[PDB]
Amino acid sequence: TSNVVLVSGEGERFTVDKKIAERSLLLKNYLNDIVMPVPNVRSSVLQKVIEWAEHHRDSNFPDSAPVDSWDREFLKVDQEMLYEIILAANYLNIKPLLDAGCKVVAEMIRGRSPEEIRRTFNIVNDFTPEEEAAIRREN
Amino acid sequence: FNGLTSPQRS
Amino acid sequence: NLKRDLITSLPFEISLKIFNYLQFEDIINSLGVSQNWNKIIRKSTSLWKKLLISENFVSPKGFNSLNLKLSQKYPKLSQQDRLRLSFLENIFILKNWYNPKFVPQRTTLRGHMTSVITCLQFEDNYVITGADDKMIRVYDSINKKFLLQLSGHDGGVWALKYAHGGILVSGSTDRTVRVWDIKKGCCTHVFEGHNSTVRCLDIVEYKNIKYIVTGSRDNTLHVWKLPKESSVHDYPLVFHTPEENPYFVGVLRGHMASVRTVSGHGNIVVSGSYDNTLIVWDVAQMKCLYILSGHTDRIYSTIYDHERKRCISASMDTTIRIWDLENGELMYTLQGHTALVGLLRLSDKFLVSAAADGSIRGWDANDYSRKFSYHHTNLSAITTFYVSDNILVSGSENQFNIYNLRSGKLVHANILKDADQIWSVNFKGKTLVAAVEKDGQSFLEILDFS
Incomplete structure (x- = not known):
């Protein structure tokens, strides 16, 4: 069986089975029209994406459903990494991975107060004391 | 009683 | 970080x-x-x-x-x-x-002179009721008060339909069809023609024109144009003879017995009769399209599902039939009641049916798989119910129940505990209304869920 090579934005070459790599619709369409560049995606990020793709090689996805336990542990990374994994999935057109990452972000928000959400993402409360109250009472 | 009231015959 | x-x-x-x-x-x-x-x-x-x-x-x-x-x-x-x-x-x-x-605020208002209420409409912040006391009563559902009584019928009122802008149509045992203007507080038109009691009626709009369709115990249906509003009379405008009535369209003959139920949308109207059959009419052409035969007893209720182009029929034979109105063919027979099925409602996701044995059934509005099943514990006939995708409210002798359709659980069984009968129930959003009987008198109950 044949492989493709995906090159990270750091110039590092990742060898991966072709049909497995076709999880990326960008790669699949690239072949339809072997080394494919993945510009502006860090090596460590691309490496995670490939790990996810190889793990899910036999997975069939539709087509709200919850995150698979392997995915939850796999997506248990620092926020910057989670951010870049989401961007790479979006660039590479891997909808199920994109979906999974978004579900994990939503889980960070779920059942949390505005103040707790702010602490999680280090967000500045830019509401004036007046505007803060007006929003609470349901705008 | 079947639950449905009806007018009487004319 | x-x-x-x-x-x-x-x-x-x-x-x-x-x-x-x-x-x-x-x-x-x-x-x-x-x-x-x-x-x-x-x-x-x-x-x-x-x-x-x-x-x-x-x-x-x-x-x-x-x-x-x-x-x-x-x-x-x-x-x-x-x-x-x-x-x-x-x-x-x-x-x-x-x-x-949670318990809703309750307003209890005087009903009719008779203890039985025969019909109720709830639209446009109006609650409108008819009874065998020949009267029509109009209520304000916002302020929860009586507004006015519409008198004029020489017989009991047995059918009501609200149109728009405070205009309503009534049918009576006096064989007349009457058009009323709430804001003028009077009858504007009296249409004669039926040779027997007007048993049921519906209003349809086809090509930006509203038509009245009235079923009667004379085995017929009459079609009439709904009169337009005036600008700037000798009210009521009485029309003793159909041919000399410019609002008269024609007669739909076909049934061999009383027309018990009617349901229409656009130019298509379905009638159900005590002759065990239904007819699908084209009121633009005034012609019979299909005759739906197969029930072995009286038809008590029908709904024209215009979204799916289907007809639903409920019968004394305890069965419910689903018909394809594209070809006039039977689609399904639903068997979930052991008594007269006389009540049908259609919400976006549920077809709901209620029977004289106190049973209520919920069917998927598209494939008619079984969604829910309820039974009033005193096994009394279901007199009325109303339903949305979220809520079922049902009534019978000594019982008034509110069900959560998501969890399938009874929420309240005692809100109208003092009622002896529930004649009619209707709700929308925060407001639930019920025409009830208590100790030989009729009352209007208004429940506020805000």
Whole structure:
């Protein structure tokens, strides 16, 4: 069986089975029209994406459903990494991975107060004391 | 009683 | 650290995807996180559209009508904010309906001179009732008070249909069809022609013209144009003879027995009769399209499902039939009652039926698989019920029940405990109304879930 090579934005070459790599619709369409560049995606990020793709090689996805336990542990990374994994999935057109990452972000928000959400993402409360109250009472 | 009231015959 | 405002940083569509995975509570909290989060959330229509749809507050097909209504109510709000405000109001109201520890405010008002109420309409902040006392009573559902009594019928009132702009149509045992203007407090038209009691009626609009269709115990249906409003008389305008009535369209003959039920939309009208058959009419051509034969006993109720182009029929033979109105063919026979099935309702997702043995059945509105099943414990005949995707309210002798259709559980069984009979029940949003009997008298009950 044949492989493709995906090159990270750091110039590092990742060898991966072709049909497995076709999880990326960008790669699949690239072949339809072997080394494919993945510009502006860090090596460590691309490496995670490939790990996810190889793990899910036999997975069939539709087509709200919850995150698979392997995915939850796999997506248990620092926020910057989670951010870049989401961007790479979006660039590479891997909808199920994109979906999974978004579900994990939503889980960070779920059942949390505005103040707790702010602490999680280090967000500045830019509401004036007046505007803060007006929003609470349901705008 | 079947639950449905009806007018009487004319 | 390595912390990051992911919602702000990510492209809009992706952050939107994240919010679609959240429950409304989390979305509400998220609005209070920062100015940017606030801006991002209030930007999408789809977010609030999805929530409204997911809670069955609106259907995809009903969305446009909701939006327009919201624009009329909130002219100076964006579509997004309109939908958010609508959602918050609806979810607040629904939670009250579902809370077994919530109790609605109750207003009890004088009913008719007779203890039995025969018909009720609830539209446009009006509650309208008819009885065998020959009277029509109109109530304000906002202020929860009696407005006026419409008199003129020489016989009992057995059919009522609200049109628009305070206009309503009535049918009586005096064989007349009457048009009323609530805001003038009088009858404007009396249409004669039926040779027996007007048993049922519906109003349809076809090509921007409203028509009245009236079923009678004379085995016929009469079709009439609904008179337009005036600008700037000898009210009521009495029309003793159909041919000399410019609002008269024609007679639909076909049934061999009383026309018990009628249901129409656009130019298509379905009638059900005591002759065990239904007829699908084309009131534009005034012609019979199909005769639906197969029931072995009286038809008591029919619904024209115009969205799916189907007919639903309920019979004394205990069966419910589904008909394909594209070819006039039987589709399904539903067997879930052991008594007369005389009551049918159709919500966006449920066909609901109620029988004289106290049984109530919920069927999927599309494939008619079994969704729910209820039974009044005293095994008394179901006299009335009303339903949405979220709530069922049913009535019978000594019983008035409110069911949560999501959990399948009874929420309240005693709100109208003092009632002896429930003649008619109807609800919309925060307001539930019921025409009841208590100790030999009729009353109108109004329940407020805000």
